[PDB]
Amino acid sequence: GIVEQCCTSICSLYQLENYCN
Amino acid sequence: FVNQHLCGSHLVEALHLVCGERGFFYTPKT
Numbered sequence: 001g002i003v004e005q006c007c008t009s010i011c012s013l014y015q016l017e018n019y020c021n
Numbered sequence: 022f023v024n025q026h027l028c029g030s031h032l033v034e035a036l037h038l039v040c041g042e043r044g045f046f047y048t049p050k051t
Contacts (some may be wrong), residue, residue: 001048006035007028013039016032019047020040 002019005011027049029037033048 003028003032003049007026008029008031010026013022013051014033016039016045019036019045021043021045 002011002015006016022035022038025031030049033045033047033049036047039045
């Protein structure tokens, strides 16, 4: 999911916003 | 929110922080 974008590269805190209800 | 790579449950430590008591729906595998 967001691991190919955060685990591989350093994403921003805005990318984890979609991970919220 | 330090410049660090989120691998494994590590990303979960940044997901609950973006939401809070609300929670989040991570999509891990292992």
